Structure formats: C-alpha cells, structure tokens
C-alpha cells in the first residue's frame, strides 16, 4: 500500500492516483 498521495514509484512525476493509482 503505497502512499497514493506520494509521487508514483514509476518515476514519472505524478502522484500514484495521478498516474498509476488511477
């Protein structure tokens, strides 16, 4: 459970929900 509000681990720049989480 990664902090959805934290920069996606993908290393793109957008937060989880703003990249992968979504």
Short mmCIF file of C-alpha atoms in Angstrom, two decimals:
data_model
loop_
_atom_site.label_atom_id
_atom_site.label_comp_id
_atom_site.label_asym_id
_atom_site.label_seq_id
_atom_site.Cartn_x
_atom_site.Cartn_y
_atom_site.Cartn_z
CA UNK A 1 0.00 0.00 0.00
CA UNK A 2 1.98 2.96 -1.33
CA UNK A 3 1.06 6.49 -0.31
CA UNK A 4 -1.27 7.34 -3.18
CA UNK A 5 -0.54 10.99 -2.40
CA UNK A 6 3.18 10.35 -2.95
CA UNK A 7 4.97 10.58 -6.35
CA UNK A 8 4.20 7.37 -8.26
CA UNK A 9 7.06 4.82 -7.95
CA UNK A 10 7.15 4.75 -11.76
CA UNK A 11 9.33 7.85 -11.54
CA UNK A 12 7.26 9.95 -13.93
CA UNK A 13 6.43 12.89 -11.68
CA UNK A 14 2.72 12.47 -10.98
CA UNK A 15 1.47 11.02 -7.69
CA UNK A 16 0.13 7.46 -7.55
CA UNK A 17 -3.54 8.33 -8.06
CA UNK A 18 -2.28 10.87 -10.59
CA UNK A 19 -0.53 8.18 -12.62
CA UNK A 20 -0.81 4.52 -11.58
CA UNK A 21 -3.30 4.67 -8.72
CA UNK A 22 -5.83 5.81 -11.32
#
